[PDB]
Amino acid sequence: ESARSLGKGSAPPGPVPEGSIRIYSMRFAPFAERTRLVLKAKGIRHEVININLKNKPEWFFKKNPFGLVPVLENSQGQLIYESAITCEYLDEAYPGKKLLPDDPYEKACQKMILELFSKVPSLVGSFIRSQNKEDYAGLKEEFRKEFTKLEEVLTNKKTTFFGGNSISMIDYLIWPWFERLEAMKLNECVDHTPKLKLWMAAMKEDPTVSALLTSEKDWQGFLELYLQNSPEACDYGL
Amino acid sequence: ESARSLGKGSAPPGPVPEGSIRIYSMRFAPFAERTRLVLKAKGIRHEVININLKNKPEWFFKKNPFGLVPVLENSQGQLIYESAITCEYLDEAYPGKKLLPDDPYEKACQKMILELFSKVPSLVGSFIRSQNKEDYAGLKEEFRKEFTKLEEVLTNKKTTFFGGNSISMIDYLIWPWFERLEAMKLNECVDHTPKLKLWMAAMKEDPTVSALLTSEKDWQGFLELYLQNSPEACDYGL
Ligand SMILES: N[C@@H](CCC(=O)N[C@@H](CSSC[C@H](NC(=O)CC[C@H](N)C(=O)O)C(=O)NCC(=O)O)C(=O)NCC(=O)O)C(=O)O
Ligand SMILES: N[C@@H](CCC(=O)N[C@@H](CSSC[C@H](NC(=O)CC[C@H](N)C(=O)O)C(=O)NCC(=O)O)C(=O)NCC(=O)O)C(=O)O
Ligand SMILES: N[C@@H](CCC(=O)N[C@@H](CSCC(=O)c1ccc([N+](=O)[O-])cc1)C(=O)NCC(=O)O)C(=O)O
Ligand SMILES: N[C@@H](CCC(=O)N[C@@H](CSCC(=O)c1ccc([N+](=O)[O-])cc1)C(=O)NCC(=O)O)C(=O)O
């Protein structure tokens, strides 16, 4: 119940309490899942306000003039948005093991892999609107090209994850789009990419990933409503 | 003469000497100017290899598989690309005053302003191909919308530059597209944005900006050839 989204007409929320940080999110948004994975991995005390993205509160544009999730707001009232920016902010502003490497080159490398990956979210957007078996074959091809590039990174590095043999920031940043791959009927696109397939399996075993994983059933329920343009999609299940 | 670009058929360059870093650049490329402004501002010893982007050396794709400038290569053979990534790398890997703030929020802010600005390079690409007075009026409008957003940042901050009252990373990252504004006949788009106009004037007074500024005459010579699709554009003037 408490997870229900805030939409048009809702009262603006109060101040974030000292000792917590707040994320404005939506339970099915992969960009916000990045930020939540980082919050979870670093053990950062936080609250979540879900936003009805189909019927947004007017006040939400005071949080982010772009009107998008994720957004962080801290107890000092500071606002941070763009998922990758929010993630690096958390890594720097909070204690515990650092998800990004301290080494400048290794850090730059993670950011270059993110750029390599950056076509995938737009492709997923397109697959979700694919109309027939002809479109779907073409989509499968574009994903295959993209996935072969990621395979090459793992091949060159000889490690299970993209930043080393332990999970790190870059893995959490790309994960949410792979999470949805099964549902979108694109789990055959990883057939030519064996290291990437192993990576997926290893990601699903990570405690932070597992804790935040959404079931096939729930994602499908959301997708059905989202594509029906329903103002209740964001609250699928409740 | 030494600044002449390397193109198809050129021998791959040798190793970068210990104590220097190398930038693969092109004298008229605004994305590479970012990196050169940072090299200059931090006093970093470096060499430049200009790339003929119309007729690229095959070996350049071993430096950057995307085939784009800028690219950094250091004496250890490490390769970094994407202009913003190269700039942050230099700020972290070399001594001297830091162009990016140490504070996580203030740093995240610079990155958010960069995202705010990020439509402008694609617009400049479009203006350069604008065909008549009707297209040009429409372009002027899109720039005006974008420039009003940047004006708002300076208004909210009450400082001459985008990261404070002293020049910092964010200013150097956005400067190269404003440098070209005069030439593109878009210097009237800043009429409604007075703080942004003052910013331009202050940028031109910066020693690092001034040292790297290209004259109206030379940019025009390059543009003329670039749009004529000439393999000699990159070496305009020599
Ligand atoms: N560069 C930004 C992008 C952030 C972004 O796009 N956020 C989305 C979160 S939903 S994540 C991205 C996108 N989903 C959406 O755009 C949802 C749109 C909303 N439901 C509406 O009603 O308009 C998507 O492709 N999901 C994959 C899938 O459906 O399987 C958002 O808030 N959109 C609101 C809007 O566009 O107005 C970042 O990295 O943070
Ligand atoms: N995201 C990357 C973008 C880098 C990028 O686009 N680099 C350009 C440098 S030229 S800077 C960007 C672009 N110029 C060009 O694309 C030049 C293309 C080349 N001359 C050719 O022959 O294809 C531009 O719009 N300039 C404004 C102007 O002309 O006034 C490049 O190497 N292009 C090679 C290519 O596309 O194949 C980054 O930030 O580094
Ligand atoms: N619109 C802009 C592009 C916006 C953009 O690309 N942002 C970066 C992320 S913002 C940069 C940053 O500061 C950062 C912080 C942390 C990490 N990291 O943790 O690895 C990496 C980069 C990115 O790689 N976007 C692609 C994506 O987010 O999928 C344009 O048209 O040019
Ligand atoms: N293709 C991608 C977008 C690529 C991208 O947006 N890169 C960042 C820059 S890369 C992030 C980063 O790590 C960084 C490093 C330094 C600074 N800074 O010094 O301020 C900021 C961000 C950016 O803001 N691009 C916009 C631009 O470069 O104009 C996509 O489709 O999503």
Side-chain angles (χ1 to χ4, degrees), chain A residues 66 78-82 85 88-89 92-93 104-105 107-108 111-112 115-116 119, chain B residues 66 78-82 85 88-89 92-93 104-105 107-108 111-112 115-116 119:
Chain A
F66 290 122
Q78 294 176 328
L79 295 158
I80 305 90
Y81 44 84
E82 296 302 318
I85 300 186
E88 181 158 29
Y89 172 80
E92 293 177 352
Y105 170 70
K107 177 152 67 174
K111 302 181 168 200
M112 295 156 68
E115 181 59 22
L116 175 50
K119 303 180 181 63
Chain B
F66 290 122
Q78 294 176 328
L79 295 158
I80 305 90
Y81 44 84
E82 296 302 318
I85 300 186
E88 181 158 29
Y89 172 80
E92 293 177 352
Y105 170 70
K107 177 152 67 174
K111 302 181 168 200
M112 295 156 68
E115 181 59 22
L116 175 50
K119 303 180 181 63

Side-chain angles (χ1 to χ4, degrees), chain A residues 79-139:
Chain A
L79 295 158
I80 305 90
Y81 44 84
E82 296 302 318
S83 61
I85 300 186
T86 65
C87 286
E88 181 158 29
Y89 172 80
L90 297 167
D91 198 39
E92 293 177 352
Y94 287 88
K97 300 299 180 180
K98 296 287 147 254
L99 295 176
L100 282 160
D102 300 330
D103 180 68
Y105 170 70
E106 292 300 346
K107 177 152 67 174
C109 267
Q110 297 220 356
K111 302 181 168 200
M112 295 156 68
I113 295 161
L114 189 62
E115 181 59 22
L116 175 50
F117 165 83
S118 66
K119 303 180 181 63
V120 170
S122 53
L123 286 180
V124 171
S126 298
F127 183 101
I128 292 298
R129 302 183 302 91
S130 173
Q131 303 173 196
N132 60 37
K133 71 194 185 195
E134 189 181 0
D135 302 345
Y136 173 83
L139 265 296

Side-chain angles (χ1 to χ4, degrees), chain A residues 192-218:
Chain A
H192 298 355
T193 51
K195 290 44 181 178
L196 188 61
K197 279 183 68 268
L198 295 178
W199 172 83
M200 287 174 56
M203 288 297 286
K204 282 166 60 178
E205 295 152 5
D206 178 64
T208 294
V209 168
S210 299
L212 271 51
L213 267 171
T214 298
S215 81
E216 182 179 359
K217 188 68 171 179
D218 285 352

Side-chain angles (χ1 to χ4, degrees), chain A residues 26 28-32 34 52-56 60 64 66-70 81-86 121-122 124-126 128 177 180 184 219 222-223 226-227 230 233-234, chain B residues 115:
Chain A
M26 193 274 283
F28 304 102
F31 288 104
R34 288 179 160 170
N52 190 337
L53 296 175
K54 230 293 282 88
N55 195 30
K56 298 176 192 175
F60 181 60
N64 176 3
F66 290 122
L68 307 174
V69 298
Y81 44 84
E82 296 302 318
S83 61
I85 300 186
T86 65
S122 53
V124 171
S126 298
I128 292 298
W177 286 269
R180 291 145 179 74
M184 301 170 38
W219 171 253
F222 157 78
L223 183 60
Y226 170 66
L227 303 181
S230 161
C234 292
Chain B
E115 181 59 22

Side-chain angles (χ1 to χ4, degrees), chain B residues 25-59:
Chain B
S25 186
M26 193 274 283
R27 289 178 308 135
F28 304 102
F31 288 104
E33 193 185 359
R34 288 179 160 170
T35 305
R36 296 189 298 102
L37 289 158
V38 170
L39 292 163
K40 181 77 85 177
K42 297 187 70 74
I44 296 170
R45 179 185 306 88
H46 64 283
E47 41 181 64
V48 176
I49 292 189
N50 288 309
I51 298 296
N52 190 337
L53 296 175
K54 230 293 282 88
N55 195 30
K56 298 176 192 175
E58 310 93 318
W59 56 257

Side-chain angles (χ1 to χ4, degrees), chain A residues 109-110 112-114 116-117 146-168 170-172 174-175 178 190 192-203:
Chain A
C109 267
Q110 297 220 356
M112 295 156 68
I113 295 161
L114 189 62
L116 175 50
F117 165 83
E146 253 303 298
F147 293 168
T148 69
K149 295 178 185 299
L150 294 172
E151 181 81 0
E152 286 180 359
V153 174
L154 294 170
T155 292
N156 299 347
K157 281 172 156 282
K158 293 296 187 297
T159 60
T160 284
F161 305 89
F162 284 95
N165 260 91
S166 301
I167 195 176
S168 69
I170 179 67
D171 304 289
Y172 290 121
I174 73 180
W175 173 249
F178 284 89
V190 285
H192 298 355
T193 51
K195 290 44 181 178
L196 188 61
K197 279 183 68 268
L198 295 178
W199 172 83
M200 287 174 56
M203 288 297 286

